[PDB]
A paper describes a structure:
The nucleosome core particle (NCP) is composed of DNA wrapped around an octamer of four histone proteins (H2A, H2B, H3 and H4) and serves as a DNA compaction unit, inhibitor of transcription and dynamic molecular interaction platform.
In order to investigate the molecular details of divergence in [name] nucleosomes, we determined the structure of [name] NCP at a global resolution of 3.3 Å by single particle cryogenic electron microscopy (cryo-EM). The low stability of the NCPs required us to perform mild chemical crosslinking prior to purification and sample preparation. Compared to the H. sapiens NCP, the coin face of the [name] NCP exhibits compression along the horizontal axis, with inwards shifts of histone-DNA interactions at super helical locations (SHL) 2 and 6. We could reliably model only 126 bp of the 145 bp present, presuming that the missing ends of the DNA are flexibly tethered. Electrostatic interactions and the hydrophobic core of the H3–H3 four-helix bundle are disrupted (Hs H3-Ala111, Hs H3-Ala114 and H3-Leu109 to Tb H3-Cys108, Tb H3-Ser111 and Tb H3-Arg106, respectively). A π-stacking network mediated by Hs H2B-Tyr83, H4-Tyr72 and H4-Tyr88 is absent due to the loss of two of the three tyrosines in [name]. While overall DNA-protein contacts are reduced in the [name] NCP, a unique exception occurs at SHL3.5, where a concentrated cluster of positively charged residues reinforces DNA binding at the dimer-dimer interface of histones H2A and H2B.
Author numbering:
A (entry chain G): 14 to 111
B (entry chain A): 39 to 129
C (entry chain B): 24 to 99
D (entry chain H), H (entry chain D): 19 to 111
E (entry chain E): 45 to 129
F (entry chain F): 24 to 98
G (entry chain C): 15 to 111
The structure:
DNA sequence: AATCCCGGTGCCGAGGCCGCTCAATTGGTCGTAGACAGCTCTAGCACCGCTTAAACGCACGTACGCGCTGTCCCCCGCGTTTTAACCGCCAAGGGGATTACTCCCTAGTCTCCAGGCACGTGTCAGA
DNA sequence: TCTGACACGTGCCTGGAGACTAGGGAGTAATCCCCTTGGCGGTTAAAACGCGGGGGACAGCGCGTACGTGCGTTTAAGCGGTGCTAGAGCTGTCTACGACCAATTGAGCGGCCTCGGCACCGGGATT
């Protein structure tokens, strides 16, 4: 774990997120707290997607322990909020909900 | 037996994830379209697949929308006016 | 577009969830598929030509698709 | 060859935190990696738009609080802002 | 028939302007009470609300005429919404 | 939302080009209009709250609409 | 301005450059970039006004002022500019019959 | 009171270029002003996205060529890029 | 007549460990712009009253909506034959990718003036 | 025709512009090898055609009810004129902090290795 990410308790890297923000030239200057906040938001969103995908994999008749792209697609399309954010988004080799 | 193999294909091809368009003729179509801009342009093997999957998604969404319009019209047979209506309402 | 066989259109429609297909749907779906692919390729070639490259890469196609609001996941 | 930077380690750590016995295929790794990249770009573009419209030059936490509230749906955005504020308060002190 | 052409030719604001202000302020209070507005922004929020509803109803008309009818029905509005988001 | 009367919906429909309106259309149109206005105001409120101001200027509403997709010219 | 008239344009090239810098779209902004942006903006404005003028003559009344209704009609009629502006709602505009 | 920055003067000159006696209302002036503003925003945002994708730090004429190619429709894009290149070449000499 | 559960497997394919480096981290300086306080007067909310466009309640006819009937040919769906798509393989080499290097082009500073704009007014479209 | 509305005159002011300096970064040459083209053959799923028939597409008919249209009453919208004041817009200022640089180093990545999780396929349950 990175020193500046562990101090914030997150899992995503604060330093790399800040570097990506600076390299993208989104703004002339970027606050240090902004990188921490973006890392936290990305971590939460990834965690939410992974929780939904895990629940959808558990919902399947087969107790598969590997997250196939179809499982991620089903978890996204079955949700009411993560499926609205990811509308007009095509998951590769994910198919469509039946 | 009209009304048996149709839903067989509906449930067979909606639970699947593999590609549907034949890869070689779609690749030929992509290269023919690109040749109208600059001849001799080279395509990454991944770029053709990334275009094919997006085209599959677009056509699947368009045909599902057209089927919704046809069902709204009280039919089960999609017709060109259904496709035109779906395209007009989408954009 | 004549390489886009009736079988491919039928499979796409069955995945989309239609029951019966008219004999004229194939031509119109071929037309719209050709238009979409033409737009995508004409948009990706701009990215490829800007970067002094003669090879259209998957990142260029993904960016072109994102331009039209058809964001694609898994090719970057 | 230059090293390629991806969120594979981070996404895998998040999965292990969520469920230790789970795993995803390489294609699902790419899907989640592109998901993170797309959300990064979408939130940062809204933050940059906020900076541009109000004639500022710093992209801090507020510019991302408002960006998250703007982009994501309300119920998911509320949790995202709560977690971001929690992490910022943890890091500052 | 007359009113269709009369309203297509016209370009004035169509929704009632004070009830719309009441709706905007009610929604703002529902989000969080105490927020003040601007008299130059309600009109902006209305000319993009009447435009949205007019486009939706034109799409509804296309859907209903496609069905052989001339009268819009809730299923037509639902098809128009489901076809665009 | 009940303030939005039947006459306004009928006039908007006439501008949309219909010839006849069902009796159940009015409630659905009121619901859709309320939802759209709720989203637009929710977003303009976020833009205003960032600015540390408590007024919603036309610029904020225009930006909220622009993010939503329905761009607006003239403000 | 010196550069606006030197480039052969009527739109500013100083305003455009300063706007681009203030937007922070990139850390460095080329001098030719301002000229190119000003040229593109001028051409698009000229095309929009040309369409508005053309569509104002077809009206039943020979109005010599471009009302928002007339410019909206001109935008809606053209395929090319219409596709670009296919989702914008001009303030106090209208819907083509 | 800060001065107001608009394109009214340039829009008026552009209108005078085609038809001298043609005139336009204040609301139409605001319409054209907003059209100019959002077209500038669209093209500049596309150019910035191109710069970010290609990992560069200059939003020059070459980036704006591709931004105009991507944003505008092809038939209008041809004329727009031709005009831009002509103006750039005229300015350079 | 068709559709789902599972045993063995081999067949990968994701996870794990070692060396290494590029980017993260820390300390120090400095300039910058963001937050804060105050002044000011803009406009935003509140209210009263007139005019009346508009909403609304009712009466009444019809004509479009919905269901039913009958046809008929437009498509399922099956078997044959063709054929072209999928995969793996061999090279050729064009071009992507990386690095070293050069210069030119742009950020920043200083000084200057004139292009842009706010108010007022002069003069002309329109209902 | 008066009513309203767009564009000169004029002065004021900030930003556009030119000269100068100083590196940052874009472009280019050199070099290496990666991946794309390509064509071919072997295979086998796929489709193109011909065909029978059956069942939805389409139209006509009929019943009715709900939707439009006209009358008449009522309701509050619009405006617009005024009034009070809450707060936006603008100006100074004083720091907190973000950029930049030099030094240090370890977290992550590429490569090699590893081991078990699982897609599959047929055989036996099921519908």
């Amino acid at each position: 774990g990175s020193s500046r990410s562990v101090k914030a308790g997150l899992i995503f890297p604060v330093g790399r997120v800040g570097t990506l923000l600076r390299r993208g030239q989104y703004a002339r200057r970027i606050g240090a707290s902004g990188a921490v906040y973006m890392a936290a938001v990305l971590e939460y969103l990834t965690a939410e997607l992974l929780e939904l995908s895990v629940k959808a994999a558990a919902q399947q008749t087969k107790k598969t322990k590997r997250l196939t792209p179809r499982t991620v697609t089903l978890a996204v399309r079955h949700d009411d909020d993560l499926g609205a954010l990811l509308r007009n988004v095509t998951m590769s080799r994910g198919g469509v909900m039946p | 037996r009209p009304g048996t193999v149709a839903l067989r294909e509906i449930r067979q091809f909606q639970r699947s994830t593999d590609l549907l368009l034949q890869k070689a003729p779609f690749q030929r179509l992509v290269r023919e379209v690109s040749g109208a801009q600059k001849e001799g342009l080279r395509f990454q093997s991944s770029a053709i697949l990334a275009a094919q999957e997006a085209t599959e998604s677009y056509i699947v969404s368009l045909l599902a929308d057209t089927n919704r319009a046809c069902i709204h019209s009280g039919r089960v047979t999609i017709q060109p006016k259904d496709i035109h209506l779906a395209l007009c309402l989408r954009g | 577009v004549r390489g886009i066989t009736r079988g491919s259109i039928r499979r796409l429609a069955r995945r989309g969830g239609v029951k019966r297909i008219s004999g004229v749907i194939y031509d119109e779906v071929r037309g719209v598929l050709k238009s979409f692919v033409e737009g995508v390729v004409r948009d990706a070639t701009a990215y490829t030509e800007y970067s002094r490259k003669k090879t259209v890469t998957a990142v260029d196609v993904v960016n072109a698709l994102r331009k039209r609001g058809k964001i694609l996941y898994g090719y970057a | 060859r230059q090293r390629k930077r991806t969120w594979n380690v981070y996404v895998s750590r998040s999965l292990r935190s969520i469920n230790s016995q789970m795993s995803m295929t390489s294609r699902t790794m790419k899907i989640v990696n592109s998901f993170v990249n797309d959300l990064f770009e979408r939130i940062a573009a809204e933050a940059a738009t906020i900076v541009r419209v109000n004639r500022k030059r710093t992209l801090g936490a507020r510019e991302l609080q408002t960006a998250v509230r703007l982009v994501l749906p309300a119920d998911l955005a509320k949790h995202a802002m709560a977690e971001g504020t929690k992490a910022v308060s943890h890091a500052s002190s």
